[PDB]
Amino acid sequence: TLIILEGPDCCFKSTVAAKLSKELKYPIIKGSSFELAKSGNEKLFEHFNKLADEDNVIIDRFVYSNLVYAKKFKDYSILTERQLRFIEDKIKAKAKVVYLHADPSVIKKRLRVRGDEYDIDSILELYREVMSNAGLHTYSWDTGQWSSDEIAKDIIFLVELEHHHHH
Amino acid sequence: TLIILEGPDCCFKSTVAAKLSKELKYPIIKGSSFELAKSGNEKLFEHFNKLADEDNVIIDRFVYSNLVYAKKFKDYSILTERQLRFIEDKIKAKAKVVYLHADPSVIKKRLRVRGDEYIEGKDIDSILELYREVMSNAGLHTYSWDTGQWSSDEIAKDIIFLVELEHHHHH
Ligand SMILES: Nc1nc2c(ncn2[C@@H]2O[C@H](COP(=O)(O)OP(=O)(O)O)[C@@H](OP(=O)(O)O)[C@H]2O)c(=O)[nH]1
Ligand SMILES: Nc1nc2c(ncn2[C@@H]2O[C@H](COP(=O)(O)OP(=O)(O)O)[C@@H](OP(=O)(O)O)[C@H]2O)c(=O)[nH]1
Ligand SMILES: [Mg+2]
Ligand SMILES: [Mg+2]
């Protein structure tokens, strides 16, 4: 199964991915790449289609993140409706979309390095809209209430069930 | 005089500003605001024009950074050639434009230590290049300092020297 982790920064995405990989033994792959989106739609889509054709992997940031940041950065290709829906229909039977987030203030506090770097409110709103428009069943966790460890365990427990395996 | 600090991130801009302010006793004001940039050109120009009326203050990032970041973010207003030219003429007799930079390697290092992980090499390069180009094309005389070999103390001292030497400069 494809475990897709989406969401704004500082929301335990990489840590979750790490825990899930150590347990499920699924390789971790970065999906939504900046420079990739700037290389054009064709390369963008072909990349997602390559991953979409795979299974038993953990994708840190994927199609939904592209729809978010494409509205923020210039020269940042975005997937067309056709492309998005094409990929969803191809992974619908094997994907698990996990949305990780936190309150705008919780994230802000998490990036205490310089008030200038801080935007976040606008990104969260976009994720919500994008996720709310997803054509796949999704699972969301408020990283502000649940720990990265409890989230990983839930996802691991879940995957083990569908695979009809014990714990 | 009006001190303007420009340049990419982690180049001692805010530190220099704080040191210059302690000495010269000039208030410190951030010029380029991400929120203001997304509120439209009219709002953008209006704000820059008001700052252009100020004097004896330090502007941490101004019209030049606007030109840089407008080419990187969407729904991010940019000054027009005419407006930029208008602001320059308006403060040419009191402005001191400072450009603080550093090699890409140095910048990337400061980002790592600052805590980033997502070191966007290519992005950082394009931004650094934009700054050089926009600064070279500045309609106002500019002073540059390679923060890779010059400390914020040494820089502030140099700038303090220039402000003092001003009542000796003509034309
Ligand atoms: N409070 C808490 N934080 C956790 C937990 N799991 C991971 N984190 C921390 O939160 C930070 C962002 O983790 P990461 O998953 O890379 O964020 P991301 O969603 O942007 O990818 C990390 O901190 P650092 O970069 O500062 O080390 C990681 O250690 C957890 O259960 N609780
Ligand atoms: N090596 C050195 N570093 C200096 C010197 N001056 C300022 N710095 C450091 O470099 C960091 C970025 O400085 P700052 O002026 O905030 O950068 P900016 O231009 O993005 O505003 C700071 O570190 P922190 O945020 O980590 O504290 C500041 O302390 C100096 O002469 N030498
Ligand atoms: Mg991550
Ligand atoms: Mg600063």
Domain ranges of chain A: 1-167
How far away is chain B from the Cα of A118, in angstroms, using its nearest Cα?
9
- Please name which of A43, A30, A45 lies closest in space to residue A82, comparing C-alpha atoms: A45
DSSP tag of B58: E
Give the nearest chain A residue to B112 (CA atoms). Answer: A113
Count Cα atoms within 13 angstroms, Cβ side, for B113. Answer: 7
The CB density around residue B25, as the number of other CB atoms within 10 Å, is 8
Cβ <8 Å between A72 and B73? yes
Size of interface A-B (CB pairs under 8 A): 22
Spatial separation of the C-alpha atoms in residues B142 and B95, rounded to whole Å: 9
Q: Structure resolution in Å?
A: 2.2
Contact residues, chain A, for B74 at CB < 8 Å: 71-74
Which ligand is in closest contact with the Cα of A32? 3
Count Cα atoms within 13 angstroms, Cβ side, for B170. Answer: 0
Strands A57-60 and B142-146: unpaired
Contact residues, chain A, for B34 at CB < 8 Å: 119
Is A52:A87 a contact under the CB 8 Å cutoff? yes
Spatial separation of the C-alpha atoms in residues A8 and A165, rounded to whole Å: 32
Spatial separation of the C-alpha atoms in residues A163 and A24, rounded to whole Å: 12
Residues in chain A: 167
DSSP letter for each residue of A87-153: HHHHHTTTEEEEEEE--HHHHHHHTTT-TTT--HHHHHHHHHHHHHT-SS-EEEEETTTS-HHHHHH
Is A88:A136 a contact under the CB 8 Å cutoff? yes
The CB density around residue B36, as the number of other CB atoms within 10 Å, is 17
Of B30, B74, B120, the CB nearest to A34: B120
Ligand 1 atom closest to A12 (CA): 15
Residues with CB under 6 A from ligand 1: A 9-15, 147-149
Give the orientation angle of helix A81-91 with respect to helix A41-52, to 10 degrees: 10
Backbone torsions φ then ψ of B99, nearest 5 degrees: -120, 110
Q: Which fold has domain A1-167?
A: Rossmann fold (3.40.50)
Structure tokens at B99: 């450009």
Choice from A4, A12, A19, A98 to test ligand 1 binding pocket (greatest atom count within 8 A of CB): A12
Structure tokens at A27: 């390789």
Backbone torsions φ then ψ of B69, nearest 5 degrees: -70, -15
Q: Which fold has domain B1-171?
A: Rossmann fold (3.40.50)
